[PDB]
Amino acid sequence: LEKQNWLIHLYYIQKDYEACKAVIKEQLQETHGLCEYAIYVQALIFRLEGNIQESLRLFQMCAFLSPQCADNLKQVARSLFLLGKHKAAIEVYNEAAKLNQKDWEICHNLGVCYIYLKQFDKAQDQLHNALHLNRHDLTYIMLGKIFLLKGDLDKAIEIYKKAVEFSPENTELLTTLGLLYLQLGIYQKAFEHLGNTLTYDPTNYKAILAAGSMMQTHGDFDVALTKYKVVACAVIESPPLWNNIGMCFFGKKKYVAAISCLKRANYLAPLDWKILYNLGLVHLTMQQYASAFHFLSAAINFQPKMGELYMLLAVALTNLEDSENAKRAYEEAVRLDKCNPLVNLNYAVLLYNQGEKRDALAQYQEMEKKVSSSLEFDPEMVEVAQKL
Amino acid sequence: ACLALADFHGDGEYKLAMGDLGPDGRQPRLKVLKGHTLVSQKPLPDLPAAAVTFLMASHEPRTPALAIASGPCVYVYKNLKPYFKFSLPSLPTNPLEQDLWNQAKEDQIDPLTLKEMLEGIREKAEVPLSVQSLRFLPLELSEMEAFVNQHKSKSIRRQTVITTMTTLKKNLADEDAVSCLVLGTENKELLVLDPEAFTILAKMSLPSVPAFLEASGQFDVEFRLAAACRNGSIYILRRDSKRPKYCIELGAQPVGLVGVHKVLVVGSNQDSLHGFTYKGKRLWTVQMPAAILAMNLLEQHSRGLQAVMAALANEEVRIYHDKVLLNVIRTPEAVTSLCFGRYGREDNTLIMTTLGGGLIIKILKLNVPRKTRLYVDQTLREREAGTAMHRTFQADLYLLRLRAARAYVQALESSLSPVSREPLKLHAVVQGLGPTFKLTLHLQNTSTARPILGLVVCFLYNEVLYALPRAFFKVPLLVPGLNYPLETFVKSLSDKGISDIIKVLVLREGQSTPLLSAHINMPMSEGL
């Protein structure tokens, strides 16, 4: 039934897929089927190509030939999971498990299936099992993904740290842990892990982007600009890179060369609220007030539950001969803002300039209840205080 | 003689060996000694199946040579028998082959052995509860693998096709302190069962995938095993799965690993010679014009390398001298492994592999944009007249919302949208010049899981210009997710070229308002 089993494996092993197919066809024509390894390798070859339908058919045939084999059921459930059907993949992995209760692949694949099925208790427990049988990097990644989707990074930092603890050369783990450090207050260990990644891969785009972001946050825009120059040619048209480059050029008072990059990034992604907010902010700083309102209103229509957006739209409306709209926009902002006193101070400035001086004190007290680093929000804090 | 692997009968002996992988796992063509000629004098082997690999040893006279038959654990070779601890396979007696040829060994390779000889097999049902070998080698599926009305029993799984063999020798006299048993199986495990203890406490595999160059790789004198990934990334998984940096030292797939008598030679996939040492560093530059298939090396010391040949994809012998290349030929094909089994001091291997099965013995800084005066004048106008621009753009946006809502309502009235609860999508394609055009309506139900039972299509045309055979027809049950092409044959009747629009209305059968519509400008006729 399987005279030339090895030759086929050696041809498939060397990424031939041409002589291996001929030997498969010859073996099958001679044996009239029942080879179970001219069908298996042929299905694996099909799966290597785009096709995942004939692979499923031939894995079905291989399962029919050996009804009590766990690997064939695993392969059939995997061919299912490569398509969109995850429930059937789970129900075939179950049968593959009731023939073998000691392998990590079944548990890892059940985890990644229950992930697509939004069953997080079963996925979490199955992936814990997959760790306990044999710890692998992809199981750690899927568990971190579960703990990020379901809850908070408080549960993901432990898992990613334990993962990077062993086999610390995986760029994905290092970079994701660094990103999750950025997501929290820690900026130091984030830099540590991003540099750890960059030692291995110097041109890692997903890590260069976050490193440049962190750099821009603490001033020193030229270092981030060089970081972006490192990867500019690899990704020549990517909205995030050009948005960060425009913010670099806006940091060092190159407002025109920042509007250029930001508009280029906006053209390549007209639905990205961050670039619209940045364009609005820069057109406010450039004192244009006609474009600023437009871009800030767009970014509002894309992310309406923000506080700074309505503040900047109201600052644009204050210089556009429309003070009632500025009033209602500031009301929206103060209702929708919680931890930014700049909105309160700017609304106090609007009120005091409107001749009220009554509710300006209310906004000043709201700001002082909210509170601290900006050099120019400090002075207006004290000037609207003493003059009120 | 039709090999899948080769061997070396004497690690330091004046002989040789081979392996047979004919039909249904019979490994009884094992060529033999008198290695001056290595003739048809072949030792009696009673092996159950094919030894999908082979190996050698030192403390014994290469007895430790392994027969890794498919579906069975390797076996140390001792002439007519085995030597196995606790996972290596059993004796010579074919456990699977015997059942087919144990009870029903009636006649030759023909249906007059089982399907037309059911005399010596309806009396003997000795291989009990047929699972491993329900079908005899002579017999075929339909009445030999389908005549299991006797038993039709089943069984459980096993290990896999052990597609490697490497063993740290010089303990084969004990055969237990040769603990290295490099079994790179086709279940992707690089399993190493303990030698003479059979514990396989550590079964970890650095392959992470299928192994192209699983063996002949990690010979460190301190036993650092080398494994090759399907991806082409070469791992450095040492003894008891030691952790070492995995070198990715290739651009293409490295499916050419080759031992060199101090280091582990690997072959670059894209016509590049592969040179490398155990610390990642590719020692050698490219030396091969085409894709090699199986390297080797002849005899010199730790500081030393004699003739280190190679295969080719177009099979040219490419003997390589330490200081220079030797030849480039046009002969038949090549192998996975050969052996310089010279009995009489030949530099050359004299091992042959062919599509035809020949057994050879021949011994021959950025792109940030620029801004001109136009830009600064425009920004100055914006800075001096921003309020009027803002106001007039807001007025224009209000008027645009008004007109867009107007046109949307007018389209809803006429139901002219080919995309419009009640999910559908239709568009009509016209094909062909000449008086007869093929008009295919691509219709699609766009919903999670809900079919649409009663729908029907009605065409509106000018009956003096186009002759539609069936200007109205029901549509099949539209399953969510499938594009149904429903085609018709439009035909131009005007002798003069006249292009007139054709409307299509998709509508329910209980309603009179079209569910949706489409338009097609019929091209010119190009008639006669």
Lookup result for tokens 């006609």: A290
B398 touches chain A (CB under 8 A): no
In the block, residue with structure tokens 């809900």: B450
* Backbone break loci in chain A, preceding residues, C–N > 2.5 A: 371
Q: Is B507 helix (H, G, I), strand (E, B) or coil?
A: strand
Q: How far is A35 from chain B, CA to nearest CA, in Å?
A: 9
**Where do the structural domains in chain B lie, given as residue ranges?**
1-90+160-364, 365-420, 421-528
Given A14, A264, A321, which is nearest B255 (Cβ)? A14
- Residues 6 or more apart in contact with residue B348 via CB below 8 angstroms: B307, B319, B340, B342, B362, B363, B364
Count other Cβ atoms within 10 Å, centred on residue B144: 22
Separation CA A99–CA A108 (nearest Å) = 16
Distance (Å, whole) CA A252 – CA A222: 9
Q: H-helix or E-strand containing B409? A: helix B386-414
HEC letters along A236-287: CCCHHHHHHHHHHHHHCCCCHHHHHHHHHHHHCCCCCHHHHHHHHHHHHHCC
Q: Which of B145, B157, B161 sits opposite A69 (nearest CB)?
A: B157
Instruction: Please classify residue B356 by burial: count the beta carbons closer than 10 Å to its beta carbon, then call 0-12 exposed, 13-18 middle and 19+ buried.
Output: exposed
The Cα–Cα gap between A315 and B494 comes to: 67
Chain A: closest CA distance from residue B214 (Å): 10
Q: Does residue B458 contact residue B441 with C-beta atoms inside 8 Å? A: no
Is residue B428 helix, strand or coil? strand
* CB contact (8 A) between residue B366 and residue A6: no
Query: What amino acid occupies position A48?
Result: L
Query: What is the amino acid identity at position B28?
Result: P
Decide if B369 and A6 are in contact by the 8 Å CB cutoff: no
Alpha-carbon distances, residue B184 vs B38, B68, B159, B198, B211 (angstroms) = 30, 11, 11, 16, 7
Residue B24: name the closest of B122, B97, B107, B123 by CA. B97
Exposed, middle or buried by CB within 10 Å (0-12, 13-18, 19+), for A344? buried
Tell me which residue of A312, A309, A316, A310 sits closest to A273, measured CA to CA.
A309
- Give the E-state strand segments of B432-515 in sequence order: 436-444, 455-460, 472-474, 483-491, 501-508
Question: Tokens for A73?
Answer: 């059921």
Which residue's entry shows tokens 């750099």?
A: A215
Contacts of A304 (CB under 8 A, 6+ apart): none
DSSP-derived secondary structure letter, B359 = -
Cα-flanking dihedrals φ and ψ of residue B460, to 5°?
Answer: -125, 115
Give the DSSP per-residue string, B195-259: TTT--------S-SS--TT-SS----TT----EE-TTSPEE--BTTTB--PPB---SS-----EE
- SS3 of residue B383 by DSSP: helix
Residue A62, Cβ density class (10 Å: 0-12 exposed, 13-18 middle, ≥19 buried): buried
The tokens for A286 are 């450039």
> What is d(CA B464, CA B289) in angstroms, rounded to the nearest whole number?
71
Rounded to whole angstroms, the Cα distance separating B104 from B126 reads 9
Distance CA A269, CA A239 (A): 6
Taking the CA of residue B500 and the nearest CA in chain A, the distance in Å comes to 39
Phi first, then psi: give them for residue A63, nearest 5 degrees: -70, -40
**Tokens representing B505?**
């209305």
**CA A130 – CA A109 distance, rounded (Å):** 9
Biggest CA–CA distance in chain B, Å, is 109
Q: What is the resolution of this structure in A?
A: 4.0
Assigned token pair, B372:
């001109």
Q: State how beta strands B436-444 and B472-474 pair.
A: unpaired
Query: Would you say the C-alpha torsion B229, B233, B238, B242 has a positive or negative sign?
Result: negative
What gap in Å lies between CA B410 and CA B415, rounded to an integer?
A: 8
Q: Which residue of B has its CA nearest to A295?
A: B390
Q: From residue B20, how far is each of A6, B140, B362, B519 by CA, in Å? A: 11, 21, 21, 71
| HEC readout, chain A | CCCCHHHHHHHHHCCCCCHHHHHHHHHHHHHCCCCCCHHHHHHHHHHHCCCCCHHHHHHHHHHHHCCCCHHHHHHHHHHHHHCCCCHHHHHHHHHHHCCCCCCHHHHHHHHHHHHHCCCHHHHHHHHHHHHHHCCCHHHHHHHHHHHHHHCCCCCHHHHHHHHHHCCCCCHHHHHHHHHHHHHCCCCHHHHHHHHHHHHHCCCCHHHHHHHHHHHHHCCCHHHHHHHHHHHCCCCCCCHHHHHHHHHHHHHCCCCHHHHHHHHHHHHCCCCCHHHHHHHHHHHHHCCCCCHHHHHHHHHHHHCCCCCHHHHHHHHHHHCCCCHHHHHHHHHHHHHHCCCCHHHHHHHHHHHHHCCCCCHHHHHHHHHHHHCCCCCCHHHHHHHHHHCC
C-alpha radius of gyration, chain B, whole number: 37
Q: Chain B interface, mutation test: which of A4, A5, A133, most B Cβ atoms within 10 Å?
A: A5
Exp. method: cryo-EM
CB B383 within 8 Å of CB A287:
yes
C-alpha count within 13 angstroms, C-beta hemisphere, residue B96: 21
CA-CA distance, A204 to B502, in Å (whole number)?
A: 55
In 3-state terms, what secondary structure has residue B396? helix
CA-CA distance, B428 to B178, in Å (whole number)?
Answer: 74
CB contacts of A167 in chain B (<8 Å) are 243
- Longest Cα–Cα distance of chain A, Å, equals 99
Q: How far apart are CA B17 and CA B27, in angstroms?
A: 12
Query: Does B50 contact A6 at a Cβ distance shorter than 8 Å?
Result: yes
> What size, in residues, is chain B?
528
> Tokens 């789970």 map to which residue?
A90
Chain A positions in Cβ-Cβ contact with residue B293 (cut-off 8 Å): 14
B364 close to B327: Cβ distance less than 8 angstroms:
yes
